[PDB]
Amino acid sequence: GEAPNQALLRILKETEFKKIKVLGTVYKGLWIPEGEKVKIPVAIKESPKANKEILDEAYVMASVDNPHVCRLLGICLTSTVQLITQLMPFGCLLDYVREHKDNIGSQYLLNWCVQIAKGMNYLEDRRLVHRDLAARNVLVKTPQHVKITDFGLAKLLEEKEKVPIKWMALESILHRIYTHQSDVWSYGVTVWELMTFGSKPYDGIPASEISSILEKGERLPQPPICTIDVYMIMVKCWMIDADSRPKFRELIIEFSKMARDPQRYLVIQGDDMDDVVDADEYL
Numbered sequence: 001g002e003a004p005n006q007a008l009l010r011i012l013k014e015t016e017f018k019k020i021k022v023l024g025t026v027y028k029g030l031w032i033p034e035g036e037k038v039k040i041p042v043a044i045k046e047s048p049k050a051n052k053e054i055l056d057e058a059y060v061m062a063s064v065d066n067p068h069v070c071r072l073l074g075i076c077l078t079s080t081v082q083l084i085t086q087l088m089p090f091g092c093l094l095d096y097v098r099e100h101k102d103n104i105g106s107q108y109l110l111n112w113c114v115q116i117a118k119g120m121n122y123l124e125d126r127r128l129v130h131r132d133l134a135a136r137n138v139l140v141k142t143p144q145h146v147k148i149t150d151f152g153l154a155k156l157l158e159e160k161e162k163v164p165i166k167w168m169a170l171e172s173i174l175h176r177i178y179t180h181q182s183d184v185w186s187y188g189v190t191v192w193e194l195m196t197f198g199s200k201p202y203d204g205i206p207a208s209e210i211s212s213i214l215e216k217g218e219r220l221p222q223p224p225i226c227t228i229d230v231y232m233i234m235v236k237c238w239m240i241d242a243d244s245r246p247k248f249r250e251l252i253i254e255f256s257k258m259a260r261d262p263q264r265y266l267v268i269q270g271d272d273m274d275d276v277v278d279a280d281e282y283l
């Protein structure tokens with residue numbers, strides 16, 4: 001007895017939206033709802049087995065509604081299956097952080113940590129396990145507002161059977177076990193990505209070696225800008241005992257307190273157009 005998932009799946013006419021540019025296949029474009037006087041900036045994502053999986057992603061993405069998770073606007077069932085979502089104009093936080101490293105202050109870094117914890121707490125609320133939390137899967141709406149995305153691996157809660165090895169709890173590398181608490185481990189790796197301005201974790205170490213390194217007690221090192229307060233939070237996300245790791249609701253609180261005095265916790269040197277409507281205001 002779980003609750004009935006009464007989310008709506010919107011089917012969009014391909015005449016309703018005009019592609020504009022390739023971004024990766026993911027395109028950017030513009031969606032004009034049916035006779036409504038609005039233009040929505042949108043990203044658009046484009047065999048049998050593959051279709052089975054992109055519909056899984058659309059199922060999850062249609063079932064979440066939170067300011068820090070990307071929601072599905074709709075699908076389009078043309079000769080190909082397209083997912084339509086809100087355009088996140090600044091793109092990937094992993095790229096954003098590498099591109100502006102000489103320009104990102106402690107306030108932004110800690111606020112990102114809070115928002116990502118909020119998104120993850122919401123997914124935990126929906127008994128939802130992401131399994132691929134990473135800085136490459138956080139998108140940037142504005143520099144002050146990020147959202148978690150990429151739900152291709154999300155499951156509705158352990159688990160079973162390519163996997164992102166350097167972001168995974170040890171119990172997931174070992175037993176294909178996945179928890180909201182294995183997500184917290186991945187959250188820690190993600191925070192480490194942001195505090196190093198985009199370093200690759202265990203850079204140079206082959207994935208085969210990862211499981212034994214974490215078994216020997218080894219962990220990612222303390223980033224330069226990080227006080228022991230921040231780094232210790234990360235280290236707690238990497239406890240062997242999954243129940244010893246912090247809850248997302250607590251990560252929200254700890255990083256919230258730090259974001260009220262950012263410099264005490266991060267040490268960083270130098271602290272066509274009418275009728276356009278963002279998806280977050282088209283309800």
Ligand SMILES: Fc1c(Br)cccc1Nc1ncnc2cc3c(cc12)OCCO3
Nearest residue numbers: 043045083084085086087088091149150
């Ligand atoms: F479209 C998607 C769906 Br549907 C499901 C999952 C992910 C995506 N990717 C994106 N979503 C919204 N804005 C984006 C903006 C981007 C981008 C991807 C975006 O790539 C890099 C540069 O700028």
